[PDB]
Design a protein around this ligand. Structure first.
Ligand SMILES: O=C(O)/C=C/c1ccc(O)cc1
Ligand SMILES: O=C(O)/C=C/c1ccc(O)cc1
Lengths: 193, 193
């Protein structure tokens, strides 16, 4: 029947064991899912050489996912958009197939603890019933500072797919976007203001 | 009816006008196509801070495209593979759909002038009748050296797609792979041997 994900019990790719020991409680709190047959879930991590609030300024921009995500043609949120849970955005995906809008809802926004998350509620692409959470975490060693971003998701495995058909694809895209986030925010850090 | 591509008459993205003036003849020679209704073609460029032969060692590895390309699960070339024109590779794509092999044929391999190219001859994905050429070029200024890689393609626009539905997708993937090529070969350069 249903199971609970175990992302909080092993070191995810891109994280060191030292860093995992610090984040184990956070992974249990925000990156645990109850999962059924026909779904898959994964946790991805990315180290960034920038301060936490620099990274968070980009991660929290629900109306501009294209700032750090690939394969987005445009993103629209209409007239009276405010950054509040329950809001939606219309993402036009670069798919190589006809025009496809992904309607996505903001599920979480915590500026104090640096957690956000969203749900794909409509759209004919390869990520049905997709739901994901992103959290941002600061680290220090001998005066040096860095950030770790954790991003997890749950998603449907389409009939005819193997779980790995879907997990490898979703992992590749999330990982590519985190690499872009790292590049964009490290550049922001190097240039300051 | 048919037309000739004009990649050699404008500065492609990622190239400076100075660099274009040097490559104009090469773009005409290796990156020109005759194109019909229902096809699209593009030219992409990527600057790399590494010597030409360092970049070429990776670009020419027809049996290991995953060294610099994303979304490749595996690549197989069988028992008696030799790096000669006419050889084929079986690429398993990360698509988020069921298992899909891309059979690809090596069309060009010129180690003196640093040109290669391949054709997708079979495979149920979004790049039907795909054909591409990659060329590598060295630059110098006041003792500093760099490389420019040019990569162009022609591909079918599926029925039901607009040309931009296909061109934006193909451009995004080629551009992402060139960014990976840059990272991989700049790392190789920094570490020498
Ligand atoms: O390629 C697909 O099937 C879906 C891609 C996708 C990319 C960005 C999104 O916000 C949603 C879906
Ligand atoms: O996503 C697709 O439809 C096709 C992808 C692709 C990626 C690498 C290849 O070598 C061929 C096709």
């Amino acid at each position: 029947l249903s199971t609970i994900t175990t992302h909080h019990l092993t070191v995810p790719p891109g994280l060191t064991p030292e860093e995992f020991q610090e984040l184990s409680s956070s992974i249990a709190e925000f990156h645990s899912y109850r999962i059924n047959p026909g779904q898959c879930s994964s946790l991805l991590a990315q180290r960034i050489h920038a301060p936490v609030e620099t990274v968070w300024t980009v991660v929290r921009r629900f109306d501009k996912p294209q700032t750090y995500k690939h394969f987005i043609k445009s993103c629209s949120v209409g007239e009276d958009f405010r950054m509040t849970v329950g809001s939606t955005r219309d993402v036009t995906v670069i798919s190589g197939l006809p025009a496809a809008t992904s309607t996505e809802r903001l599920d979480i926004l915590d500026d104090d603890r640096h957690v956000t998350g969203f749900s794909i509620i409509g759209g004919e692409h390869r990520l049905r019933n997709y739901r994901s959470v992103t959290t941002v975490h600061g680290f220090e060693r001998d005066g040096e500072i860095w950030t770790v971003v954790l991003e997890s998701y749950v998603v449907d495995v389409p009939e005819g797919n193997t779980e790995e058909d879907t997990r490898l694809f979703a992992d590749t895209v999330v990982k590519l976007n985190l690499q872009k986030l790292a590049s964009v925010t490290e550049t922001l850090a190097r240039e300051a203001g």
